[PDB]
Point group: C3
Chain length 217, copies 3
């Protein structure tokens, strides 16, 4: 139903101790990256937010983060979901600490939200109050600054991004042009925490507006 949280689910997690040099090379790891933490889940942008959160209190870097074509509902295998993320760290223990923070965040109540009665339209309107090292890098902002992380299906997202930019004192940092691999779209916008919150609220309202009257015209 409208405003229901879509629960995100972790599907697989593994640690690699002593990654092989060939893989370190293809993954373009830094010399001090000895261990990898691998994770897949059925919701990509939640997982991206969670990996970024893990970087704040552990010595891990997000070295790989990709979404699957056509999303988790079209996955052909059980563990592919719609995202793969890889953390790299100095040891299996520090990687485990990052993975633990990732899982905790994924289960913290964050998630996409339904915009209508049968949950056939959903969006992500997440106020990242202080970025870690991953989203700060991708958005081009300093670690510790705020983002609105806004995602919705393509038309909803273009419409609602415009609404969010008009409603709030925020800047466009990164545009997820439609389609992403999952056939969504959105952006990372930056500003103060209150401005990012105002952008999240406006984005959510606008997606719901489209959902209620898609063909108004």
């Amino acid at each position: 139903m409208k405003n229901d949280l879509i629960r995100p689910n972790v599907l697989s997690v593994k640690i690699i101790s002593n990654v092989s040099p060939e893989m370190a090379k293809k993954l373009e790891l830094e010399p001090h990256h000895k261990s990898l933490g691998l994770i897949t889940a059925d919701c990509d942008d939640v997982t991206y937010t969670a990996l970024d959160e893990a970087t704040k209190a552990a010595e891990v870097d997000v070295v790989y983060a990709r979404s699957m074509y056509a999303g988790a509902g079209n996955a052909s295998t059980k563990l592919a979901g719609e995202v793969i993320g890889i953390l790299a760290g100095p040891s299996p223990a520090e990687v485990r600490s990052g993975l633990n923070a990732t899982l905790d965040f994924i289960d913290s109540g964050v998630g996409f939200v339904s915009a209508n009665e049968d949950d056939s339209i959903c969006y992500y309107a997440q106020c990242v109050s202080r970025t870690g090292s991953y989203l700060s890098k991708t958005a081009g902002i300093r670690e510790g600054e705020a983002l609105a992380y806004l995602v919705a299906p393509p038309l909803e997202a273009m419409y609602a991004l415009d609404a969010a930019l008009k409603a709030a004192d925020v800047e466009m940092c990164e545009f997820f042009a439609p389609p992403t691999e999952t056939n969504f779209a959105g952006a990372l916008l930056t500003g103060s925490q209150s401005a990012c919150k105002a952008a999240c609220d406006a984005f959510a309202e606008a997606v719901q507006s489209v959902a209620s009257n898609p063909l108004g015209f």
Copy 2:
């Protein structure tokens, strides 16, 4: 069955009367582009043709147009379909005129056509007599020149494209290498108006002949 029209459907439409400067920049709007029209539908190449037509009937430009991975039948949300298009214009009235022209074209009888009994093979063989500003730029030809707009699933398309090029005095302007995002293939071909139509007819017949005998010499 064979030759049945696959009806295209519009799923959502919206106008933005005056776009935020931030979005105007990311969408690379022209300075006089104040307003946007957004549309999604369940058939990408028909929508691209329709948007091109809108640039002829109203003072609008196609500023964004992309297809969705694995097509409308695999859409995970209600309005994603398999295409998003964005028209930009000087005011909401011109954008509204462009969107109306787009919707009119989509319901005009143009569409993909079935090639077999259960409609599991389909193709597009559309002769654009006079391109607007969108398909001309996509093909690299002058606005107003003609196009054969040919799309089919990968093997059918490669076979039928080769057949069309032999059948008519046309040149390949843009190759849609398999897979497109929707797992189709095809091309935009140009030439005189009669040659583009001759190519369309040849493309259609060639797709049909594969569809009628998918394993070729293996029976």
Copy 3:
């Protein structure tokens, strides 16, 4: 069920005589290749192996080979499957021989292997004892050298590639970074035949270990 072969299927085959100059140019055909053989199937990496085998038994080159977004299970038309391949040869006779050799290999008992009861996790761990001209070119090795052709879903593949590289005297030749169009991943590894075999065995065991305990870390 676990260790079942997943049967691959050919969906469409067609021969062209005297390809158009325009299509010959776009496919970068050799001047004397006047004939094309088109094939589609529902399993991409098996078909890529089969096309490479065809180049050993007939005077054909692989000139096109691509996978479809989201795999055969999500195909929207009857003949798209998840792969298109194109063989080129001097005449329909050579192309016909190559297509027959491709079909015979696809029907030879090669295939992805199931890792669980409902065949919702599967992997490919194929030792190519003697490459043809297609996979040797893709891997950057001399024609006739051996390959381990290793494919699995994204997390399984990264984990199991690391296991394969550690288990045998092999080098990574080509990395299929997740996602491929079909939302798989893997690599081509080379070495001696026994080392490629050792890599395949290690890859298969590692994929199975993830399938048996996906969330244990």
